[PDB]
């Protein structure tokens, strides 16, 4: 099927990460010729999303691929382009972030991978403006803050470590974007983390890890 051409390329990227640069152009050209339906584009999105959220170490590769397809796919269906359909799919799991963070261990694990894929998406996803084309996804900048808030609000070890990982990955970029706009989200984050250390019932090692973030971020 057309779906299995995509999964084979995703599997190929997993096995050969270095193949991306030489094989990505051919992938886009083939998709431009065969993806002509709203449902076929929706399927392409779903397959990439599933690989990025269910397969380890595909967070970076998935996000890198999504950015490329967003500005190299020529199809523009009336229900939305690749970018729009992708973002709509993310909105689905994002809507229940508050519930996912307080779910069972497996639900939380799934949420963590979603969070870290969105973190890579924020870093990698480029958006062209009217005057300034060099911009990141602002909605993701906001979304990541809310995802962090959700994680600190359910201060279980795995949630907290997920937040640490996300802040190590995107923290510097978020810190610069917030400082440039005079926002105190970083300070809020630091205080929320401090409150976790003070009050939460999680492990001492996690708390010690959190304290070390206080040394780095401020």
């Amino acid at each position: 099927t057309l779906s299995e051409y995509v999964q084979d390329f995703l599997n190929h990227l997993t096995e050969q990460p270095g193949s991306f640069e030489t094989e990505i152009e051919q992938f886009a050209e083939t998709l431009n010729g065969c993806v002509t339906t709203d449902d076929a584009l929706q399927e392409l999105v779903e397959l990439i999303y599933q690989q990025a959220t269910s397969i380890p170490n595909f967070s970076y590769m998935g996000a890198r691929l999504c950015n490329y397809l967003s500005h190299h796919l020529t199809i523009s269906p009336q229900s939305g382009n690749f970018r729009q359909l992708l973002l709509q799919r993310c909105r689905t799991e994002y809507e229940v972030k508050d519930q996912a963070a307080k779910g069972d261990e497996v639900t939380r694990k799934r949420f963590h991978a979603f969070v870290l894929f969105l973190g890579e998406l924020y870093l990698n996803l480029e958006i062209k403006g009217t005057n300034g084309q060099v911009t990141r996804a602002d909605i993701l900048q906001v979304g990541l803050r809310e995802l962090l808030n959700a994680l600190f609000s359910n201060p279980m070890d795995d949630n907290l470590i997920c937040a640490v990982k996300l802040l190590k990955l995107t923290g510097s970029v978020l810190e610069d974007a917030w400082k440039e706009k005079g926002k105190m989200d970083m300070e809020e984050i630091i205080q929320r983390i401090e409150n976790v250390v003070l009050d939460a019932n999680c492990s001492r090692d996690v708390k010690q890890m959190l304290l070390k973030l206080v040394e780095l971020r401020s």
Partner: protein, 128 residues
């Protein structure tokens, strides 16, 4: 209980809809939406906006996730103080909006920004 004006966006309507489904639109006393707010509509039923027209400056009309606030016209004498006061009538929440006083047949971008910043709600501002 919600954030004090985070503001801004570059992403399109459907893209920004990832954050919230709540929209804040700007209307005149006749209940007719201003151009920027008219563009923000994607096939929603707007019959409810004429059902209670005409409106006083500061009147707020909500149906579902669509919010509408009656704003003063600068080309008809309206002041920045009047604009800010009308927006203070908006229930505190997270909204996807435009600049109220945009632009020709209204206030300047800086005056519209000031009124949004004076408000207690958190905004995601699309450009026009």
């Amino acid at each position: 209980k919600i954030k004090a004006c985070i503001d801004e966006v570059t992403t399109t309507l459907e893209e920004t809809k990832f954050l919230t489904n709540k929209l804040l639109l700007f209307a005149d006393i006749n209940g007719k939406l201003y151009h920027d707010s008219q563009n923000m509509l994607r096939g929603e039923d707007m019959s409810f906006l004429e059902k209670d027209a005409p409106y006083m400056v500061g009147d707020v009309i909500t149906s579902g996730d669509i919010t509408c606030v009656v704003i003063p016209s600068k080309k008809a004498g309206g002041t920045t103080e009047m604009l800010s006061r009308a927006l203070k009538k908006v229930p505190v929440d997270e909204y996807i909006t435009t600049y109220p006083g945009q632009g020709c047949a209204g206030y300047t971008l800086e005056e519209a920004k000031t009124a949004l910043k004076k408000c207690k709600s958190a905004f995601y501002v699309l450009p026009s």
